[PDB]
Amino acid sequence: KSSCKRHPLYVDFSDVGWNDWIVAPPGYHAFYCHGECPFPHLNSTNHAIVQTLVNSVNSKIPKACCVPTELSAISMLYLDENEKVVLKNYQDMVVEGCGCR
Amino acid sequence: KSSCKRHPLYVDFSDVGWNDWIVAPPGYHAFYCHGECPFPLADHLNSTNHAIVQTLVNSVNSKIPKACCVPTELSAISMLYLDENEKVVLKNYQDMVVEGCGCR
Amino acid sequence: QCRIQKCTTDFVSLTSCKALRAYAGCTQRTSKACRGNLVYHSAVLGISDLMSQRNC
Ligand SMILES: [Cl-]
Numbered sequence: 001k002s003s004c005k006r007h008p009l010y011v012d013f014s015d016v017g018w019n020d021w022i023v024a025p026p027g028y029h030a031f032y033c034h035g036e037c038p039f040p041h042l043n044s045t046n047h048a049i050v051q052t053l054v055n056s057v058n059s060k061i062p063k064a065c066c067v068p069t070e071l072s073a074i075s076m077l078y079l080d081e082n083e084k085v086v087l088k089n090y091q092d093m094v095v096e097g098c099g100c101r
Numbered sequence: 102k103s104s105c106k107r108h109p110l111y112v113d114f115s116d117v118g119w120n121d122w123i124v125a126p127p128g129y130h131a132f133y134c135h136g137e138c139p140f141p142l143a144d145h146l147n148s149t150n151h152a153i154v155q156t157l158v159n160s161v162n163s164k165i166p167k168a169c170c171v172p173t174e175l176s177a178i179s180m181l182y183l184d185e186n187e188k189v190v191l192k193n194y195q196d197m198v199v200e201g202c203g204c205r
Numbered sequence: 206q207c208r209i210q211k212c213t214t215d216f217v218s219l220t221s222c223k224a225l226r227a228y229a230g231c232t233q234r235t236s237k238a239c240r241g242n243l244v245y246h247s248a249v250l251g252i253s254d255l256m257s258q259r260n261c
Binding site: 021079081090 | 237240241243246250
């Protein structure tokens with residue numbers, strides 16, 4: 001079973017039907033997090049350390065989850081009512097790092 | 102399929118063998134997060150823009166997983182341990198208790 | 206400005222095709238002020254997706 005890490009993901013806005021409002025870009029590299037948070041190095045909270053230790057003693061309690069722990073912004077173009085271009089910075093759009101939470 | 106929410110969890114330090122260093126308490130209410138981050142609902146709830154996107158991508162391609170239900174607000178607890186001098190030391194451990202869950 | 210947060214909390218509390226219809230109008234009202242809103246543009250897609258599954 002593969003452990004917690006980032007994985008590539010290109011988001012094509014036309015595939016998600018967001019090309020009806022996003023003038024630019026046509027998509028972007030968002031990435032995603034995936035993998036096991038095993039008992040035996042990863043970025044984790046004290047809670048994630050505890051839940052992981054509890055899980056190693058009782059399986060009915062799930063392991064910590066592999067989620068984005070460092071994200072970055074992107075800028076996109078849309079149109080206002082007047083068909084004028086508006087630039088906006090969307091926060092936490094790209095995964096820079098994964099961790100167990 | 103149940104949605105993302107907090108669930109109770111009492112951690113007994115003896116059960117995890119941490120009673121060999123934690124003088125007090127005998128355990129604590131940690132809680133945990135669990136449940137689906139579904140396409141309509143997940144949005145807020147509590148989620149990053151990435152979690153909104155990944156969720157939308159998943160509704161179009163299942164091979165891309167949904168956002169995950171994790172603690173989004175945590176709180177601290179204070180515990181007692183022994184130093185080398187066998188004297189009791191109080192310390193505040195951050196992010197020990199789930200106050201809230203969200204999709205990330 | 207953009208009021209999809211108010212439309213969402215109002216639908217989420219009801220859920221705990223009569224609530225979806227009320228949420229479809231709400232988002233269409235604030236639509237002008239939600240022109241560059243990511244949470245709105247997902248809501249439009251979210252509502253539309255539940256009008257077909259379950260169909261009503
Ligand atoms: Cl997080």
